Amino acid sequence: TKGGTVKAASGFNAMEDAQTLRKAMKGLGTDEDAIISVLAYRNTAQRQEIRTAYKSTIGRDLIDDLKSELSGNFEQVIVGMMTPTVLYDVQELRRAMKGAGTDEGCLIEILASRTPEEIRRISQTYQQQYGRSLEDDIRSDTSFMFQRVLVSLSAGGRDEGNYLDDALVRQDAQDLYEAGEKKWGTDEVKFLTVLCSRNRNHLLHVFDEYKRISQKDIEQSIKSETSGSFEDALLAIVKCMRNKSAYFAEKLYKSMKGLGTDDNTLIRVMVSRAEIDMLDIRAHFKRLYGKSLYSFIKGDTSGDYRKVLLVLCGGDD
Ligand SMILES: [Ca+2]
């Protein structure tokens, strides 16, 4: 509703930007501020035009140069910014699954918050890039009910449109209420089938009906009736169906509120949402947490890494 912080620049001159960036890198050292002052003030599409212009104006490769000159978390953010939107998601999913470990939080976040149409583009691109099925990789990297949720989301087969079947909304709400009072454990299949199959309008109506019949929010019941990564995935679906901006505020809060910082999450959220809904994220952050997002980033990061994240945030003093 308020939208993003990062917008398409006016007066955009790709060749001039190419020259600014080369000047920033050429010779010993780097002018990191100059890099920020260009890249954080162009949108992702414009940054692709810079890449093209850099080859033809400078006779070099921009990403290669950035990678050579920069390091650490600042390099990660800048290279992130330079990556086409779909490919960035693809590469984040790959990173989350590569090796014996898994970044489960990353999988949840992307697969719960992207639309089916976005998931299909991601899935296609992952297949083309790696010659691997996204669904098959997810299936390998996760287990049990958590796997069922993530495989379903990755398959991108949720009902679409906004058709409202009042009788089915009622039935679903009742079914979820009963699934929670089954004698020998929650019926987790009912939860995951409703939450993974139904269209958004329908689910928003189920959530309201569930509260009407149970006097409890569906999130409260999820928290008391499920556990583990499976719980976390179901909560992510619900939160994303209600208000994805709020979900991402929560993701940012959790990435910073502890001792230390979940940089991978902070970076991905800030890069991936700066053009979509960062102003809404900021608003919801302030409501939930009574502090500005800006102040959290300022307090938990430093250096050029801080600088660029604060430009992505927008604001604020
Ligand atoms: Ca240099």
Ligand SMILES: [Ca+2]
């Ligand atoms: Ca793995």
Ligand SMILES: [Ca+2]
């Ligand atoms: Ca911290």
